[PDB]
Amino acid sequence: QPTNGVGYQPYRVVVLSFELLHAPATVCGPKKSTNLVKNKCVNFNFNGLT
Amino acid sequence: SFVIRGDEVRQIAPGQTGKIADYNYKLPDDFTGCVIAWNSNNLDSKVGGN
Amino acid sequence: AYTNSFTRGVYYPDKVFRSSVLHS
């Protein structure tokens, strides 16, 4: 009821559960790829693996 | 010294994020000091809006 | 009736490459 104090008011809840297994990705952040430079040393990130 | 809405008081601490922390007032990670705050609805609010 | 499995039914435990190594 709308007469209730906040401890007795309804709350909606969403729980995002994540896994990055010893297996590939299927969900990613908005971040954008760049060119694969082979045969030089690079700072790198593959599927979030920095 | 400054004024904010009550929900933003959580942003006035070291290592935080959000519109106030990131675009208005940023504390250093090693901040040494006291954050002191009080509700001022009796002074800082006006009909139709301050 | 039954039969002995011997050393059958092993599989790759994860999608990880490993070589020239023993892994537990």
């Binding site: 709350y11 969403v14 729980v15 995002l16 559960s17 994540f18 896994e19 990055l20 297994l21 297996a23 590939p24 990705a25 299927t26 969900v27 990613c28 952040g29 908005p30 971040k31 990130n45 599927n47 979030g48 | 929900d7 994020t17 959000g18 519109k19 | -």
Partner: protein
């Protein structure tokens, strides 16, 4: 809550900044990850309960 719903989220790009910067949420707690960092990650699966 006794028979809570679950949605599979997969094969898509997220933007968690649109979630965690929203004024709509009264609590936003993360475990094993930072909320600011989620846009730098990828996941095998995501489950929305």
């Amino acid at each position: 809550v006794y028979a809570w719903n679950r949605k599979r989220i997969s094969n898509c790009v997220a933007d968690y900044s649109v979630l965690y910067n929203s004024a709509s949420f009264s609590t936003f707690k993360c475990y094993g990850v930072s909320p600011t960092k989620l846009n730098d990650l990828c996941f095998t699966n995501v489950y929305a309960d």
